[PDB]
Amino acid sequence: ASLAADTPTACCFSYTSRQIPQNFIADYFETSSQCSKPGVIFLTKRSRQVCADPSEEWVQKYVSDLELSA
Amino acid sequence: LAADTPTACCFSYTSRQIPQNFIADYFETSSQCSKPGVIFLTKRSRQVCADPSEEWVQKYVSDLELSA
Amino acid sequence: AADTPTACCFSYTSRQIPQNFIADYFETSSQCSKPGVIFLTKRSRQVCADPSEEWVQKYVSDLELSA
Amino acid sequence: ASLAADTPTACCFSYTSRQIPQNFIADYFETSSQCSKPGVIFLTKRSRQVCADPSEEWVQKYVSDLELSA
Amino acid sequence: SLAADTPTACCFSYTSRQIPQNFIADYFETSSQCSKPGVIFLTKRSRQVCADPSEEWVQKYVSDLELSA
């Protein structure tokens, strides 16, 4: 019936300023296209969720590395 | 052998072309769905809905099928 | 295959499969409530298709006459 | 000595509901008299086996056409 | 999920002395919206201390917490 679902969605409004040490990263998630701003959510090994700017190269590198090492 | 099982449906497509080297597999969505759809499965097991009428989508599906 | 379950189709694909994806075909049992042809893709997908459609009949013929 | 052999025999319990395209047929076989139902097994060019009812007209014709074209 | 439009912890000065590592229970990176960068260390008695992210012992502590989780 409706166009969108009634479950809350994770969106990024502010990103981390500095590059996270890559050996801390456990996984990644892409934020919904519904969000006003584009965003990658990094999941650390200590299970923290950190918002990252997908326009930054280290963010793109990390995502690529996670995909190509799965 | 699953039965009375939920069906994957796409209600929106990605507007961006996914990096092809991320793709691990693909699935056509059921004709019972309102919209046509191809679900790409990344190697990190992410799932992205894509428009089957798009050329790059058709190309990715072709490459996956013909390289099996 | 003694008392094994039989594959039946309850919904067909709405889009014609590109023929160069087709690896094999399988007819469904006449015991099924609906007619059906199961196409096997080269990536080993099993897809239900409507036997009343010409392209389905054509694909099966081509698989047959090339065997 | 036994009355029957201890090798399994092909029996038709359910037939096909629709007539096979004749140009798919490669061969035919009559099912054993030991079977509960009479049956003709059509060997398809892609090595498929299809149970057909020998009472139906198209089945009888196919068999005849096969034998008379050998 | 969790509450929103909530205040954010920010550091405006760092501890001049290294914290004994066996006191450390957890660490927290301060928001990029804060005027200064910072790592908040949480002791086992829930004391909160701001530390300079550029200092070596701070980075070691953060690493040991992440890599052992």
Phi, psi (5° rounding) for residue A42?
-95, 130
Most D CBs within 10 Å: which of C30, C33, C38, as the mutation test of the D interface?
C30
The single residue listed with the structure tokens 């081509």 is C62
- Amino acid type, D53: D
Give the residues across from A51 on adjacent strands: A41
Handedness of CA A14, A15, A18, A24 (dihedral sign): positive
Phi, psi (5° rounding) for residue C37?
-115, 125
Q: Which structure tokens are listed for D4?
A: 């029957």
Handedness of CA A47, A50, A53, A59 (dihedral sign): negative
Q: Which structure tokens are listed for A38?
A: 């584009």
Give the residues across from A27 on adjacent strands: A43
Return the number of other C-beta atoms located less than 10 Å from residue E13's C-beta.
Answer: 9
Contact between B39 and B10 under an 8 Å Cβ cutoff? The reply is yes
Cα–Cα distances in Å, from A58 out to A7, A24, A46? 31, 14, 20
The verdict on a CB contact (< 8 Å) between E32 and A21 is no
Q: Name the interface residues of B facing C (CB cutoff 8 Å).
A: 1, 25, 27-28, 30-32, 36, 52, 62, 64-66, 68
Collect all residues of chain C within an 8 Å Cβ-Cβ radius of residue D42.
none
Collect all residues of chain B within an 8 Å Cβ-Cβ radius of residue A27.
44
CA A20 to CA C11: how far, in whole Å? 48
CATH number belonging to domain E1-69: 2.40.50.40
Nearest residue to E34 via CA among A17, C28, D58: A17
The verdict on a CB contact (< 8 Å) between B15 and A3 is no
Q: Among E1, E31, E67, select the one facing A45 at the smallest CB separation.
A: E67
CA A26 to CA A45: how far, in whole Å? 5
B–C interface: beta-carbon pairs under 8 A: 33
CATH number belonging to domain C1-67: 2.40.50.40
The verdict on a CB contact (< 8 Å) between A3 and B19 is no
CA C9 to CA C53: how far, in whole Å? 15
CA E16 to CA A1: how far, in whole Å? 60
Tally of residues, chain B? 68
User: Burial letters for B2-23: b for 16+ Cβ neighbours within 10 Å, e otherwise?
Assistant: eeeeeeeebeebbeeebeeebb
CA D68 to CA E33: how far, in whole Å? 90
Cα–Cα distances in Å, from D36 out to A14, C61, D6, D14, D27? 76, 33, 17, 11, 23
Collect all residues of chain C within an 8 Å Cβ-Cβ radius of residue B1.
5
Q: Among B11, B15, B43, select the one facing A70 at the smallest CB separation.
A: B43
Q: Which structure tokens are listed for A10?
A: 């994770």
Collect all residues of chain D within an 8 Å Cβ-Cβ radius of residue C65.
23-24, 45
- Amino acid type, C57: Q
For chain E, give every domain's residue range. 1-69
Handedness of CA D14, D18, D24, D28 (dihedral sign): positive
Phi, psi (5° rounding) for residue C24?
-160, 170
- Those chains having 3 or more beta-carbon pairs within 8 angstroms of chain C are B, D
- Amino acid type, E43: T
Q: What is the dihedral of CA C52, C58, C64, C67, to 10 degrees?
A: -150
What's the CATH architecture for D1-70? Answer: Beta Barrel (2.40)
Cα–Cα distances in Å, from C36 out to A19, C11, C47, C56, D17? 55, 9, 10, 10, 12
The DSSP element (H or E) to which A30 belongs, if any, is strand A25-30
The single residue listed with the structure tokens 């201390």 is E49
Cα–Cα distances in Å, from B39 out to B5, B13, B50, E62? 17, 9, 6, 39
DSSP 8-state assignment for residue C15: S
- Amino acid type, D43: L
Tell me the DSSP string of E2-28: ---S------SS--SSPPPGGGEEEEE
CA D37 to CA C59: how far, in whole Å? 33
Phi, psi (5° rounding) for residue B50?
-140, 150
Phi, psi (5° rounding) for residue D9?
-120, 145
Q: What is the dihedral of CA B30, B32, B35, B39, to 10 degrees?
A: -20
Give the residues across from E41 on adjacent strands: E27, E49
- Long-range contacts from B36-43, C-beta under 8 angstroms, 24+ separation: B36/B10, B36/C14, B36/C15, B37/B9, B37/B10, B37/B13, B38/B10, B39/B8, B39/B10, B42/A67, B42/A70, B42/B18, B43/A67, B43/A68, B43/A70
Nearest residue to C48 via CA among C21, C15, C1: C15
Q: What is the dihedral of CA B62, B33, A36, B14, to 10 degrees?
A: 10
The verdict on a CB contact (< 8 Å) between D47 and C31 is no
Method of determination used here? X-ray
Most C CBs within 10 Å: which of D11, D22, D45, D49, as the mutation test of the C interface?
D45
Collect all residues of chain C within an 8 Å Cβ-Cβ radius of residue D45.
64-65, 67
CATH number belonging to domain B1-68: 2.40.50.40
CA A52 to CA A14: how far, in whole Å? 8
Most C CBs within 10 Å: which of D13, D16, D19, D24, as the mutation test of the C interface?
D24
The verdict on a CB contact (< 8 Å) between C11 and B28 is no
Q: Among C5, C12, C42, select the one facing B65 at the smallest CB separation.
A: C42
The gap between the terminal CA atoms of chain C, to the nearest Å, is 24
Q: Which structure tokens are listed for D21?
A: 């395209």
Q: Which structure tokens are listed for D30?
A: 């009559």
Nearest residue to C14 via CA among B29, E44, A68, A45: B29
The verdict on a CB contact (< 8 Å) between E66 and A47 is no
C–D interface: beta-carbon pairs under 8 A: 25
Nearest residue to D16 via CA among D67, D68, D44, C1: D44
Nearest residue to A36 via CA among A60, A15, A54, A12: A12
Q: What is the 3-state secondary structure (H, E, C) of chain D?
A: CCCCCCCCCCCCCCCCCCCCCHHHEEEEEECCCCCCCCCEEEEECCCCEEEECCCCHHHHHHHHHHHCCC
Resolution of the experimentally solved model in angstroms: 2.5
Contact between E61 and E27 under an 8 Å Cβ cutoff? The reply is yes
